[PDB]
Amino acid sequence: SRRYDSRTTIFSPEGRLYQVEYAMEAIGHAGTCLGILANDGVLLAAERRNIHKLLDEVFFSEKIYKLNEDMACSVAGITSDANVLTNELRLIAQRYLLQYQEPIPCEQLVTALCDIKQAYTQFGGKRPFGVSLLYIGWDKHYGFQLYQSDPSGNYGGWKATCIGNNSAAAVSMLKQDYKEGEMTLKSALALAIKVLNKTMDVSKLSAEKVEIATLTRENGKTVIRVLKQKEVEQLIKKHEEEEAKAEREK
Amino acid sequence: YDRGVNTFSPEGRLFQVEYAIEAIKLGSTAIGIQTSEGVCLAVEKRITSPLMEPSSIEKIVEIDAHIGCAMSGLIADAKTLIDKARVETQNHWFTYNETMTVESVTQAVSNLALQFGEEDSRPFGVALLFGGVDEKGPQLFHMDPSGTFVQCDARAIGSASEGAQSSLQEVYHKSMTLKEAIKSSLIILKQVMEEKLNATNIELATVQPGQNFHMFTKEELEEVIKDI
Amino acid sequence: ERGYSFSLTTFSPSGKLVQIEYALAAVAGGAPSVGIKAANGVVLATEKKQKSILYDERSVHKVEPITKHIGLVYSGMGPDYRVLVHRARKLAQQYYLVYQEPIPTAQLVQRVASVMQEYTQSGGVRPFGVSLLICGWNEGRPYLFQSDPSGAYFAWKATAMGKNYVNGKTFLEKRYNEDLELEDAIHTAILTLKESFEGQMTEDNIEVGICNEAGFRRLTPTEVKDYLAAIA
Amino acid sequence: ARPDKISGADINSICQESGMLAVRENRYIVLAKDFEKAYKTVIKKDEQEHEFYK
Amino acid sequence: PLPDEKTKKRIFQIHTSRMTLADDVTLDDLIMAKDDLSGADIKAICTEAGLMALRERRMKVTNEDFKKSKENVLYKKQEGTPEGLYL
Amino acid sequence: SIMSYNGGAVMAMKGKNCVAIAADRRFGIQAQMVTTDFQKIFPMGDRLYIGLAGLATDVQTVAQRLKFRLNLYELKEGRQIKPYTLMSMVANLLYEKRFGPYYTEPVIAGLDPKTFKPFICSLDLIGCPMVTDDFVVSGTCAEQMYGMCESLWEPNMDPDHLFETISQAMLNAVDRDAVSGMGVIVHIIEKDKITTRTLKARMD
Amino acid sequence: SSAGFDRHITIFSPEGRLYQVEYAFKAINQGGLTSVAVRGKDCAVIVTQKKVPDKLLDSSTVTHLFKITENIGCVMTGMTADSRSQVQRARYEAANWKYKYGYEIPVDMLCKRIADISQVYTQNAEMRPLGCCMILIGIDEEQGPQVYKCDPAGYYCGFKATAAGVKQTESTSFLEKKVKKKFDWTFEQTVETAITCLSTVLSIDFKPSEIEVGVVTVENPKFRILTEAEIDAHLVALAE
Amino acid sequence: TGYDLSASTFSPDGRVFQVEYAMKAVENSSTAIGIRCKDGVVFGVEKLVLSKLYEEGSNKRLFNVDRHVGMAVAGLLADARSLADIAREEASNFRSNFGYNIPLKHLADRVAMYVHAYTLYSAVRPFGCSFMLGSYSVNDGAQLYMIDPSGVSYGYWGCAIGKARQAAKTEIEKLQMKEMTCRDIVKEVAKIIYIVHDEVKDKAFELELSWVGELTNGRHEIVPKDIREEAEKYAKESLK
Amino acid sequence: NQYDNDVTVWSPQGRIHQIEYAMEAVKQGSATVGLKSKTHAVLVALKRAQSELAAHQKKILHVDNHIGISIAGLTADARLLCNFMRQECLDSRFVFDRPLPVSRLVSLIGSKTQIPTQRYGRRPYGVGLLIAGYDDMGPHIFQTCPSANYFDCRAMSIGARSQSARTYLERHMSEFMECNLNELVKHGLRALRETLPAEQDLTTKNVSIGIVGKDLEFTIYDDDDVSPFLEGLEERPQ
Amino acid sequence: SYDRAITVFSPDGHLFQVEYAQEAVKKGSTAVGVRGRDIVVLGVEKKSVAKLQDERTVRKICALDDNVCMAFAGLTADARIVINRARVECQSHRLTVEDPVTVEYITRYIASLKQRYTQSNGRRPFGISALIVGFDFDGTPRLYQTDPSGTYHAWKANAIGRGAKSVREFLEKNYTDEAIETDDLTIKLVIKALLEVVQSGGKNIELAVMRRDQSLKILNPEEIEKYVAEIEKEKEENE
C-alpha cells in the first residue's frame, strides 16, 4: 500500500527538491513566450506549436488568455493544466471584484495563484503543476507590469522575460539590446520580431508561426489588442528591411 | 527498507520508539536529585558560540507554581508537551479546586506519548524530568518517549547518563539535605561539561514546601559556584 | 476507501509525463476513425469490425449523440469511453438547466477537457485511454474538436485517430480540401476509412453519423449500405 | 479463414503439419477435421477483454 | 565549492600566465559580463577567441563578430539560467 | 408593505426598433429620504441593461451577483450574452434562494446584439419569467403605471414618441405615489447610441 | 514489456497494455465450466453443467442459474465469490430501477449498469477487478429474446449465440459452424443444439442430472429452470 | 516475487495467492466435523489438551448465533469470534426488521458477502476462518452450510474442517443421512472423532458436541456431555 | 523476509508474523503468576527496576471493585486497554446498575484488540493481561494475547522464563483447589521464586500480590502488607 | 485524504528532513544583522540580481507589523506562507491585548507552527531559517532566529545562509563594545562585515534599519556607496 507510493514531496539527499527540477525541465520544452520594456503599451509573444495546415483557427487566441478587463496571461508547457489555472485564476479575480467593487491589482492575483501551486508542492503526495506562465496588465497604482511564475511558486517581476529554454538566448539578446523607457511601439515590436527572428530557428519568421497580443491603456477602455496577420506581415517586412539595411556595414 | 512506521521488531518492540531512544543520547545532560526537603535540579545550556545570548535558552520551564520541569533532546518537541501539560493541570484545577498531583501529570502526558500513525506521525523525541511537591512530599519523576513512566530518586539523562548515574550512586544516600545536594550536582556537571563552568553555562531549579518560590535568579549561582 | 490518494503519474528525469505517453500508445492500439468538417455540417466515420459472425451489430453503437445537435466518437477503449460519455450526458444538462439554451460544443470540450485533465492528477487512477472526436452545429458554423488523454483539445479541419493515423493524416492532407458538400464529405471519409480496412466493407463494418445545421441525425445501415456501394 | 485467425505465426512448416495430420488419417482424401485440428493447437490465443475496441 | 569572483580571476589569470591572447587581457570585464558559471568555459570562449581571429592568421578583433560569437556561449549558459532560483 | 420599505419602480417599454428603460432613484427608509443619487439601473454588457426595484439591499447584492456570473460568462465564451440567457440566469439566481427569498423584482430590457430586435421581460422574486410585447412594471406603485401604459402605448414607436410616452407615464405615475419620487431617469437606447436623460420632476 | 509496478496494479505498460484485466480474462479458467447461450426465434436457452465431486454435497445449492427478476435470468462462470457478489448488485439495481422508473427494466440497461460498476472496479487502482463473467437473458417489447455477456473489463456486450469460460474457444468455433446456415430456430432445435454443441466439446454424452437448463419463451415470459424429467425428455429426444 | 504480498493483485497464472494462503491457514487447525440427519443437525469438535492448559469449557469453538443457528469454527480463532459477533448482529437486524426468524440461506449470504468483502482491498487481509452453520425449522427443515475463507457458501449433508480433513470425511459416506435419527448420529459422530486424530500426535484430547433439531424444539444448545455419555462408551469399545 | 512487513500480509506458511513478534514482546516482560482456588483468586507479579535508585515499576493495577488485571510487556497500551477497561466497566455499571461478570468483559477486549490486527497500518497491542474477578459463579483467571485469544485456565504465567512457573504448577494443580488464602498466596509466589536465578532473593521490595474474594474487595499489597506474607517460606535447595 | 508519515526517526537518532532540510538554508542567499543599543540593522546579500530588471518584487526584507522586521534565507517560496500566516497571527494579537506584538511571541508562533508542520502527516517540513528583529514596546531592541526544527534562539548578531561559519566567525572580531557606540558604526559595521561576504560590489547589498520608533527604512543606494567610501578609506588608513 505504501510500497506503491512514488514520494513526490520529500527532499532528496543532495540538497534540492527532486521533483520541482523535473517540473522545470518540462517548462523547458514546447514553450516560447516573452514581453518587452514598454511605456503606453505592453506586448506578448507566442510561438505556434501546431503550425499544420489542418487546424481551424477559430479559437481567436492560441496562447493568450484574457482573464479580466485589464489583464492576460501566456500558457507555457502542459496546456490543459493551465486550463485549470485560468479557471481558478479567473475565478479569483472575479471574486475579488465581487468583494470590493474594484479591479484586482496584479500582485495579489499572482500570490493568490502561487499559494495554490506552492500548496501542491508543500504537501499531498501529489503531481505538481507544470505551467510557468506570464502576466501583463494595468493597475491603479503602478501603471504597467510584468510577472513570472514557477512550479515552486516563486514569482518575479521583469521588464523583459524568459519562456522557456530557448529564451535564455533571448535574455542574452535582450540584455545586449537593452534600453530604458522607449515605446514607441514600432521600436518594441521591431525588437520583439527581431528576437523571435534570431532566437527561433525557422528562417525568415513566417507570418503564421508568431502571435503578438498588445495592451494599450485607454481611458476607460484599457484595450487588450490582439492583432491580426495583416498587421503582422508588414511588420515582418519592416524587420527584413532593417536586416537588409543593417547588413550593409560589412 | 522504509517499512511500516508502526511495525514491531524481530526481538521485538517498536522500531521507531527504539530509534527514538537513541535521539536522547545526543541531547544535553541534566541531573535531578530528590531531597527530603525538596527537589533540586540541574541542566547545562550548551552555549554554542559567543554570538548567542545565554539567558534566552530554556531548559527549565515551570509548569504550575508547584511543579517544576526539565526538558532534553529536541526542545521544540518538548514545548508542545509543556504547553498542553499546563492545560491539563489547569483543567484539573477548574474541575476540582485542588492542585493536580505530580503523578497524574505524567499519566496525562504519557497517555499520548504514543499517538503516532496514519489514521486516528512520529513519536516524540524528548526525555522529560518532572519535579514538584504535592501532598505526598517532594516527588521526582522521569518520562521517556515510550511512555514508560517511573519514579526515579536521582535520575540523570542524556549524553552524560552513564557516567553521571554510575558516579552518582556513590555520592547519594537517604538523608541528603538541600545545600548539600546543590553543590553535589555541580561537581558532576563540571566533570561532564566541555566548556568551563561559569555563570552562563548551567541553571539550577529548586522547589520546596517551605522555600517557595524561590524560583531561579542569577547571582545566586555566582555564590553557588564560588563555594567549590 | 483508504485515503491513499497519491498520484502515480509523476515526472520523468527528462520531464515527460510517462502515463500520458503510454496512454497515447493505447490510443494508437485502438480502432481507426476519421471525421471531416465540410461547409454545412460535420461527418464522423468510425470503423467497427465484429470479431466473429456470431456477433450482433444492432446492440452497441459508436456514434453516440450528446444533445439533439452534438455527436461524439472515439478511438481507444470502449469501457473507458462510456464513462465520460455519461459524464458529458450529465454535464450538458446542468448547462441546459441553468442557462436554458442549447449548449455550445466549444463549451463541451472545455468542460470535458477539464474533467479529463483534472482526472490525470487525482488520487491513484490511470488516465483514460480514449481520444474523442466531438462535432456539432452551433450558431451557424459547424465545429469539429478532438480531445486526448492529456486533456488537451484541438480544432481540426478534417483529422483521423486510431490505427494508421499518419496514413489517413497524409491522405486527408491532400484529398481533404477547401470546401465540399455533406455528401462529398461522406465519400472521402469512407475512402479514408477504406485506407486501412479488410477485404470487404459492409453496413455492419462502418457506421457513419452527420450533423445537419438543422439538427443531428445518426444514419441507418440502409443508407450506410447504399453509399458504400459505390466503393467509397 | 478460421485457421488463419489462430496462426502464430508459426507460418511455413505448420502448414506441413497440416499435411502431417493427413498421415494421421486413416482417410484417403484429407477430412476437414484434420486441417482445423492441426492449426488450433499452436499457437493458442486468449481473448477478449481488451482488443474488443475493433 | 563553486568558484567566486576571487577564485575565477585567480583561475584565469594564472591559467593564462603561460600564454595569453593578444596580451591586453583584462579580467575585470570578463567575470563581470557573464554571471555566473565555472572557470571551465572561460578558457573555451578564449579558445575560440584567438581561434576565430586565426582567420586573420594572427591578430585582430571584430566588434560585430566577437559579440556575436560570444552570443553562442552566452546563450548556452542563458538557456538554463533558472533552477529555481536555486537557493 | 415589505416592498414599501424603500419604494421605487422600474418601467421598460418596447418601441418599434428602440427600447426605453426608466426608473426612479429616491432612496429612503419608509417615510424619510436620504439621498437622490441612488442607482437602480445597471449596465450589463453593451446595448443592454437591467432594472431593479424593491428592498435596496437585495438590489445591490443581486446586482453584484449578476455582474459576477455575467463577467464570468463573457469570459468563458467570446460572444456577448443573448437576453434570453440573461433572463434564465436571473431566474436561476433568484431560484437558488427559494425559501429565503431576495426581495426584488428585476426588469431586463435590452436589444439583441445579433439584430436590432428589442426585448423586455420582468421576473418575480421567486423567479418566474414573463415576456411581453408592450411594457413591464415592477415596484410598490404598479396600478398607476398600468393605468398609464395601457392608454399611452402605441405599437410602432419612433424614439421621440417613446421618450415622451415613458416621460408622461413615469411623471404622472410616480407623482400619484407617495413613497417614491425625487427624480426620474430615462434610458432610451437604440441601435446607434445610448441616451440618458433626467426629467424635470417634482421634488415633493 | 514492463516498467515499474505495471505487473501489479492497473496502470499502463509501455506497449499500451494493462496486465490485470488480461489476467482476469483467465481468472475465469479456474472454474471448469462450459456455458452456452442460444437465442432462438421466440425463445432463448441457457445451458450449464455442474460438477458434484462428493456424494455429500447437494444438488440444490450448486446451481449457477441465478434469477434476477421475474423476466431476467442469468448464469455465472468464473470464480464463485465474485460471481455471487455480482448477483446482489444485479438484483439491487434491478429493484431500484423498479422503484425509480416504475416499469420493468430492459435486459439491455442492466448490463450497462454492471459494466460501468465493473469499470469503476477496473479504473481505480487499489481494488480487485472481480474476475467473474456475467451472462444474461431476457425478453423485450417487440425485440424478441435477448442474450448479453458482461466480461470483467467493463463492456456490455450481447450477441446471437455466445459462450465464454474454459472450453469456449472451440465452442465459439462450433457455433460459427452451426449458426450461419439456412436453418431457422424452433424451440427443440435451440435446446437440441444447446446440448449437442456442448457434447461436441466434452465428448461424454452423459446423464440428464448434470446440465442445468434455464429457458425463457414468449408464451409465458417468466424465467424458468427446467425440471429433470423434461430435461431427460430433451436429452433422449435428441438421440435418434 | 511481488505477486504474493498484496491481496488485490492477480498472479500471472491467474489465481490470488493471499486467498490461497488463507485456505491453508485453516489447514493447520484441528478437525471439527458436522452432519445432518432427517430432522436435525449434529456437530462435533475435537479439542486439544496437552497437559494442563485450560479449564474444561474454555474458548469453545461451538458458538450460538441465533436461537436456532450455531457455529462450529476452525482455523484461527479471533477472527472467528469476530464473525460470530457480526453474524450475531445480522440476525439481530433481520429479527428486528422483518418480524420472523432468520432463514439459513440469507444468513449464509450476508455473512459470506462480508468474508468476500475482505478479499478485495489491501486495506484488510482475507479472513482465516471457516465455520459450519446448522439449523432447524419446521417450515424449513435442517440445512447445513459451509463457509470457507474465500467466500464460497454452499450446502453439505456432511463436512469436515481441520488437519485430519480428508480422513475425517472419508467415513461419512458409510453413514446414511436419510433414515437415521440424530440420537444415533451423536455416537455415530463420536466414534470417528475418537477414531480420527490418532494419539501419537497429541497425547490427549477432549470432545464437544452440539445438537440442534426437532428433539430440542428449535433451540440450539450443547448436549450435556455427561448425560447419556454415549461417546466413550462406544469409543473404548471401537478400537478392535 | 519481505512478507514480514505488515499485519496485512499472510505468510506462505500460514502464520502472520506481526502476531509472532508481538508474542515476543509479551515474553520480554517480567514474570507474573495468577492462580485460583474454588473460593478465591490470587495473582502475584514480580517488579523490576531500571537502576538501584529508581523505584520498581509496578504491574498490578486496580480496575473495578472486583476486576483486577496483571500486566507484562508495553506500558502505554496497558494504560489504553486500562482506560477502555474502566469505561466498559462503568458503562454497564451506569446502565444496568449491576456489576459486570468477567466472561462477557473479555469479549470486548478481543473485539477491541481485533481490529488493530487486521486493517492496514495498525499494530497489535503488546499486552499481558491476567484478568481476575468474581461473577456470581466464583473466581476466574483469564489470560490474553496480542492475537486476541483468551483462555479460561485454572493457573497460568506469562513473562520472562515463565515456563518454569508452569512446570511448578502442574505438580500442584491437584492441590490448588481446596486451600484458603494464607498458603494459596505462598503457593503462588513459589512459582515466582522458580522464575528467578537461584542466587538472589526473593526480596520484599519487589513482589506485589493481589487477591479478589467474596467478603474481600480487590486489594493490592505493596512490600509492607506483603512483609506478613513473605515470612515463613522454605529455603531454596542446594 | 493524505495519511502518510513523511518525517520519521533514522536509526542513528536523527530526523532526516529537519536535519537534512537545512541544506536548503545552506544554499540560499546570505543575510546578516546586528542590533545596536538604539537602532538595529539587518541586510540581505548575495542577491545575484539581473542588474537590468525589476527589484521591488525580489524584496526579501518585509514587515509583519511596523514593530517587527523580517529577514530570511533558503528558498523564498516556502517563506512566503510563513510570513503571511505570521501576519494573520500578529493582527489578532492586536485584536486581543492592546500592546503591540512582542517579538518573542511572534518567534514562538513561527517556531511552533514550523514544529507542528514537521510533526504532522503528509507534510514536507519548511526549508527556511529566518530572522525576526524589532525594537519592542518599552524601547528595548532584541533579535531571534528560527530553525526548521523550530527552535527560536536569541543572538546578538547574525550569520545565516551561504558561509554562516565565515561571517559568524568574523563577528567575534566585531564584538568589541566600541562597535557599536555609534549608529553609523553599526551600519558601516554591517556592510564592512558583508565585505567578507559575497562579491560586495555595491549592487547586491540591500540593507534596512529601524530607529526604535520609526517604520523600517529601506535605504537607497546612496549612503551604501558612502559607507563603502569611508570603509575603503578606513582600509587606506589601516596601513
Numbering used by the authors:
A (entry chain I): 2 to 251
B (entry chain K): 8 to 127, 134 to 241
C (entry chain H): 3 to 234
D (entry chain D): 365 to 418
E (entry chain B): 354 to 440
F (entry chain P): 2 to 205
G (entry chain G), H (entry chain M): 5 to 244
I (entry chain L): 4 to 241
What does the publication say?
The structure of the ATP-γ-S-bound RP–CP subcomplex in the SA or SC state was nearly identical to the ATP-bound conformation in the same state13.
A set of ubiquitylation pathways conjugate ubiquitin moieties on target proteins, which are then recognized and degraded by the 2.5-MDa 26S proteasome holoenzyme. Substrate entry into this chamber for degradation is controlled by the axial channel in the center of a heptameric α-ring, also called the CP gate, positioned on each side of the CP.
